[PDB]
Copies of this chain bind each other. A is one copy, B any other.
Amino acid sequence: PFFPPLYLGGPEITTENCEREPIHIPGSIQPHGALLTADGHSGEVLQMSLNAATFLGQEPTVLRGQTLAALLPEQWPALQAALPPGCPDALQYRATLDWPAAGHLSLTVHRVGELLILEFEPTEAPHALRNAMFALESAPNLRALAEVATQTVRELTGFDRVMLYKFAPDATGEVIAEARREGLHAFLGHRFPASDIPAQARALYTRHLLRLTADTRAAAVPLDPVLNPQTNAPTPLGGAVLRATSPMHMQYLRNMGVGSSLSVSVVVGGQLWGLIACHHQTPYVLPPDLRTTLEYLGRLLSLQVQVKEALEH
């Protein structure tokens, strides 16, 4: 099963009980964005991140009464149609708001049962993706495909280190390709225990295909209330990219000297084949539109891995 989260007086996590930390329900988010939850029917704002006032420019109480209808007039009917009752928690809808306080915000919404989860992040506003797609497809074998993928991602993102991280049948991990800035340790060829990515993290990575820690030293921002009014239970945040990262994993990243981390799942035959894994030495908020490019690349790599593995077997 899972332990209760901390804020419901559950045990603190150790290397004895890695597998039991309820990473989906931390009750908090990373501070480079803001999150609101809301009722599926009424559009009634039920929870907000204590930092919402910053991003939205709204007097705190104003929000926690109001309706999405009021708050987002153009958007609220689109949401209603895009995310019908009963849809999967994996389905997401995005829009760009030109919002008074903040030039442009990206809005990302998904639905978990009766709750809409809304994420707001700063945003903005060429051929590198098309060029990359053809490059991946003409790679002659899996090894070269891995090399092209890591190089392409590094060029698109500027990340200090990009890895392709392949799982063995026992969930042992192996770095099979790597693109990195001069003057970093090489992780190429190295293998790591299964517990470095626990079973509960791997399952959630099979369904929700991108996550990040924008700053490995930033404090999480609580949800208020912490419990969903609807259920008097924790809000599931696994489908939210703003979700606070596990402190265990933040400790792991800090001990390696990483300041910003991001990975993308490569899913083949319904299973987690590996990850595009990115390190930066310093804090780094990759903007939403560039993340989208990596999300596309994730799908394309999933296709090409199967194609390429089929021409060996």
A→B interface (CB under 8 Å): 82, 87-88, 90-96, 126-127, 129-131, 133-135, 137-138, 269-270, 292, 295-296, 299-300, 302-303, 306-307, 310
Contact = CB atoms under 8 A, between A and B. Distances in A.
A46 B205 CA distance: 52
Contacts of A133: 295-296, 299
A131 B94 contact: yes
Contacts of A126: 95-96
Contacts of A302: 303
Nearest to A140: B88
A270 B300 CA distance: 15
A134 B90 contact: yes
Given A138-B87, A269-B310, A94 B130 contact: yes
Contacts of A82: 131, 135
Contact of A91 (B95, B127, B138, B295): B138
B269 A92 contact: no
24 contacts: A82-B131, A90-B137, A90-B138, A91-B134, A91-B137, A91-B138, A92-B131, A92-B134, A93-B131, A93-B134, A94-B127, A94-B130, A94-B131, A95-B127, A96-B126, A130-B292, A130-B295, A133-B295, A133-B296, A133-B299, A296-B296, A299-B299, A299-B303, A303-B303
Q: Is the interface of A mostly helix, strand, loop or mixed?
A: helix
Interface centre among A92, A96, A130, A269 (most CB of B within 10 A): A130
A229 B92 CA distance: 54
A107 to B, nearest CB: 9
A135 B91 contact: yes
